[PDB]
Amino acid sequence: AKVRIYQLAKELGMETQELLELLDQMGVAYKSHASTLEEKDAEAVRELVKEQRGLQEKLAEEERRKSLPRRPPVVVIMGHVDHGKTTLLDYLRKSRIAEKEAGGITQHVGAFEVKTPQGTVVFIDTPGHEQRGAKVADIAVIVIAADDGIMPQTEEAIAHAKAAGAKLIFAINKIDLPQADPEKVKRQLMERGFVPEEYGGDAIVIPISAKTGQGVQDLLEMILLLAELEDYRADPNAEPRGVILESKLDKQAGIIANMLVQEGTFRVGDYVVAGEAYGRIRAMMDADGNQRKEAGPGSAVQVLGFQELPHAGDVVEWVPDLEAAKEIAEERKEERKAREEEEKARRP
Ligand SMILES: Nc1nc2c(ncn2[C@@H]2O[C@H](COP(=O)(O)OP(=O)(O)O)[C@@H](O)[C@H]2O)c(=O)[nH]1
Ligand SMILES: [Mg+2]
């Protein structure tokens, strides 16, 4: 029936003066908040309030989806042979679960994570050295032995990592050694125009012992700090996009591929295409051996269902159906072949 303004105001959990100015902008006349509202008007208020409150919750949804979730830094390790690359990766692999008994069951997916209080770091670990494959690492850790120092190979790796677009972090290794001269290496860096932060330059340089583990925990915090600065994010709802780390044959399983997920979320049953390779994702396994229904940005998973071995560095793309996967793969397969007469029938 006929509601009093203060009764409706309470009904909507609304402020007296708030409802009064609402009536004012609605063009509904009154005396005071004691005044009776008609049935039309009262319903118009309930309806207008519902819309205004609807839009406000809608409008705030678009705004917080504007902010994309954080993603972990993807780190690669480089530098001259014997400088400790493998030793560092091994210590890092034994770092994360360093107090646990097994389980895992631990499997090699092409990269592994280090869970740390300040955050999570992803380390590419794969055989082989340094077209090129689509961007993988955000950060390159350039390892330098303190008893040897910068070598032409070190300079090559520094150049490679910059060309690929990686941020550089210099790790001076083997500081445990008595013949180690960390300062000498620092001078070598500065001679080449890399000036350590302590001296007011932007070069990030940390002392480490891959044998001992000294500086390693500090190296991690530095990686995460540089990530905080760089502010890496990714959209888990974007069309799924990833990169092949490696492809492999297994006697029982057949063709298997490790991929790093970059954007979106891949799901079991998805059709994917990498280069000329396509397939349906049959299964996914993470570094902990667990089966995975979904893999989001930063996730490194072993994928089943590829029809051919993909190539390392090729972009894994999501496709709607099998038909699209085949057509997309075949146009690329035909591009390569047909164009190969162009490098043959022409100049050798
Ligand atoms: N003392 C000491 N030896 C190290 C350190 N890091 C690596 N090494 C040694 O360097 C040798 C080769 O290391 P490796 O990781 O295979 O070099 P890589 O080619 O860069 O991978 C091994 O015998 C390690 O024991 C370190 O921090 N301290
Ligand atoms: Mg080695």
Numbering used by the authors: 2 to 131, 138 to 355
What did the original publication write about this model?
Translation initiation factor 2 (IF2) is involved in the early steps of bacterial protein synthesis. It promotes the stabilization of the initiator tRNA on the 30S initiation complex (IC) and triggers GTP hydrolysis upon ribosomal subunit joining. IF2 is also responsible for the fast subunit association and 70S IC formation, an event that is directly coupled to the activation of the IF2 GTPase. Here, we present the crystal structure of the eubacterial IF2 core as the individual apoprotein and in GTP-bound and GDP-bound forms.
Comparison of the GTP and GDP complexes of IF2 reveals several significant differences within the nucleotide-binding site. The largest conformational changes are observed for residues located around the γ-phosphate group. The Val82 side chain, which moves strongly upon nucleotide binding in order to comply with reasonable van der Waals distances to the γ-phosphate, rotates slightly between the GTP-bound and GDP-bound states. Upon GTP hydrolysis and phosphate release Lys86 releases its hydrogen bond to the GTP γ-phosphate and becomes available for interaction with His130. However, it is striking that the histidine adopts two nucleotide-dependent conformations. In the presence of GTP His130 is rotated away from the nucleotide, clearly in order to avoid uncontrolled GTP hydrolysis occurring; in the GDP-bound state Lys86 occupies the place of the GTP γ-phosphate and forms a hydrogen bond to His130. It is therefore likely that when activated by the 50S ribosomal subunit in the full ribosome context His130 adopts a conformation similar to that observed in the GDP complex, in which it is perfectly positioned to activate the water molecule located next to the γ-­phosphate.
